[PDB]
Each structure stands twice: as structure tokens, then as C-alpha cells.
């Protein structure tokens, strides 16, 4: 995988193939995060193959749809249960994020395992994402925003568009 752009949040179901023995097999829903459905079905088969004795050839994808967000206008607290590999071993993690969308928080989790642990998009394995109540969060980087009268200034407003006035008379101001 490669966490291109922003990840979408896909809901893929899929079943094994019908046979004389199992006239109808059970369907199997998964909750994939991937750039597009073509990568979502391939991670659906990666997972189903790592859990059930089932391959892409021996089965079929019954439905691959994108599941939107139920409240993309409410700041939420998502908690994710990672599973990744380093240069030496493989570890489970649990990271929390404040975001509006679940796929948003998962994109932020891929960019965060990339930043902090240099974990490429193919080592990571999201195993559970869950919207958490603000009073169940644990990371102090996310509990610190659970204030009703929050208040802070933007203290060092570094000048951007450094090249539109590229040659100027006055010197830039940073207090605002």
C-alpha cells in the first residue's frame, strides 16, 4: 500500500466461492482504509487471506462501497489500534487523534507512524478504530484540548509569501 492523498474509508464485504459442499458460504465484512476501491479490495484480500483459509481466486467480493462520515462537522476523538514492524520485531500500539473524519484520523495516523517511527505504509496494520468519549482519552496531547474555554495566541507568526514582495524596503513584522 501507499497512503496517497487522503485515505477513504471503505466497507468491503466478500465471500468464498459457492461449491457442492458449502452451497452458500458466510459473508465477511471488513473496514478498509485505502486511497481507492482498487487498493481497498486488495487489502481486503490481504486481510481475509491472513485470517481465513481464503484467497482472491477461491472467493469473490460481494460489495465494495465507501462509507461516509455520520457527523463530519463535529470534532471527535478517534483511537486506533496499530500493528506494525520496525527494523527488529513487530509491535502493537494505540494512538489517539482529534479529527472530524475517521479516514482523516487514519491518514493522520499513517503520517504519524511515518514521522515518529519511520514506518512505511505497508508495515502498518490498522486493526480497530473507535470514536472515544473525551473522558476516556489517555494521551495528554489529546486531553489538553478537552477544555470548554480554550484560549491561546498565535505567538510567532512567521511571514509566508516571502517572495511576492521579494525585494522590499520595510522589515517583516511577526507580532499580530
Amino acid at each position: 500500500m501507499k497512503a496517497s492523498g487522503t485515505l477513504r474509508e471503505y466497507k468491503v464485504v466478500g465471500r468464498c466461492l459457492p461449491t457442492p459442499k458449502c452451497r452458500t458460504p458466510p459473508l465477511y465484512r471488513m473496514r478498509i482504509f485505502a486511497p481507492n476501491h482498487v487498493v481497498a479490495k486488495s487489502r481486503f484480500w490481504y486481510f481475509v487471506s491472513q485470517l481465513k483459509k481464503m484467497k482472491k481466486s477461491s472467493g469473490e467480493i460481494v460489495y465494495c462501497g465507501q462509507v461516509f462520515e455520520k457527523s463530519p462537522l463535529r470534532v471527535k476523538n478517534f483511537g486506533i489500534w496499530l500493528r506494525y514492524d520496525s527494523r527488529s520485531g513487530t509491535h502493537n500500539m494505540y494512538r489517539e487523534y482529534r479529527d472530524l473524519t475517521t479516514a482523516g484520523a487514519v491518514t493522520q495516523c499513517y503520517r504519524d507512524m511515518g514521522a515518529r517511527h519511520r514506518a512505511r505504509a505497508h508495515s502498518i496494520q490498522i486493526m480497530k478504530v473507535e470514536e472515544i468519549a473525551a473522558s476516556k482519552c489517555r494521551r495528554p496531547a489529546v486531553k489538553q484540548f478537552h477544555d470548554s474555554k480554550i484560549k491561546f495566541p498565535l505567538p510567532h507568526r512567521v511571514l509566508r509569501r516571502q517572495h511576492k514582495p521579494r525585494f522590499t524596503t520595510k522589515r517583516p513584522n511577526t507580532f499580530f
Binding site: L27, R29, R31, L51
Partner: protein
């Protein structure tokens, strides 16, 4: 450099299978071969007379000659740039009737049949083999229980 022995490198090829040693069955000797039979070679190591050279064990060929205890067959040999047609006198114990042509024959007679019929009813039947086509569209009934939800398992250093 290796040796050019007639039987170098046949310790497993010419050995008998597990618990299949001893006397050779007699259906091997009481079955018939006629010029034109597609025969495949498998050197049996029990009988040593008329053993086919190791470079033919596993090839298929057709018979062109028949003597008392042995036939003569024409197997193709890939020799370093080209595929010669070689004529070997393999004894009977190193031979099976290859069931490859068989299915073609049981399809030929099935075609001649299904063409004999469907000729008086004016219809048109399919006589060619078509490749396994892309599977057509179907409904998957999810009667009652919704699809079970799967998710990866955590890691367990069970080493």
C-alpha cells in the same frame, strides 16, 4: 566433469516407490499395444532388460513396432538446438497407456454424436471448448444475519 555412465543420476528415478517393491503386477504384461498408441515412458527398476535410457523417463511417444517382450516407440528428444525423433525399443514393463489422447477420443465420439443428433432437430449445439468465461452476475442473498466483521489480530511473540 561428470561421468557418462548409462545410469548416472537415477538413484531416485529408477527406484521403486515405498512399499511397492517385489513382484511386478501382471496387468503390466497382459495389456496390448498397437502401432499408433500414444505411450508414455516410466522406467521401472525391477526388470533390468530393455530399460529406457534415463533421458526418456517421463516423455511421451507413439508406438511404431511390436515384438514379443517389447515395443518400439518414437519419442521426441530436445538435443541442444533441435528436437530429433528418436526410435527406442522400450520393454513393456517401462510403459503405460497415456490417458491424454483418451479424453480427446471420448470428446471426439461425443462430438460425432451431438452432431448426429441436433441435425434432425435443426438446432445448433456448441462443439468447441470455450475458456472458463468471466462469471456472470448473481444476487448474494444475505438472509437474516449480517456479514460477520473481521479485523486483524494483535501480535503475539509466541517464539
Amino acid at each position: 566433469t561428470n561421468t557418462k555412465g548409462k545410469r548416472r543420476g537415477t538413484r531416485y528415478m529408477f527406484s521403486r516407490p515405498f512399499r511397492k517393491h517385489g513382484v511386478v503386477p501382471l496387468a503390466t504384461y497382459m495389456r496390448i499395444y498397437k502401432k499408433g498408441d500414444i505411450v508414455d515412458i516410466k522406467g521401472m527398476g525391477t526388470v533390468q532388460k530393455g530399460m529406457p535410457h534415463k533421458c526418456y523417463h517421463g516423455k511421451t511417444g507413439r508406438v511404431y513396432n511390436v515384438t514379443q517382450h517389447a515395443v518400439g516407440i518414437v519419442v521426441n528428444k530436445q538435443v541442444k538446438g533441435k528436437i530429433l525423433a528418436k526410435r527406442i525399443n522400450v520393454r513393456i514393463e517401462h510403459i503405460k497407456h497415456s490417458k491424454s489422447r483418451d479424453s480427446f477420443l471420448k470428446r471426439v465420439k461425443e462430438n460425432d454424436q451431438k452432431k448426429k443428433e441436433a441435425k434432425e432437430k435443426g438446432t445448433w449445439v456448441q462443439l468447441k471448448r470455450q475458456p472458463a468465461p468471466p462469471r456472470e452476475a448473481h444476487f448474494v442473498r444475505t438472509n437474516g444475519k449480517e456479514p460477520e466483521l473481521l479485523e486483524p489480530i494483535p501480535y503475539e511473540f509466541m517464539a
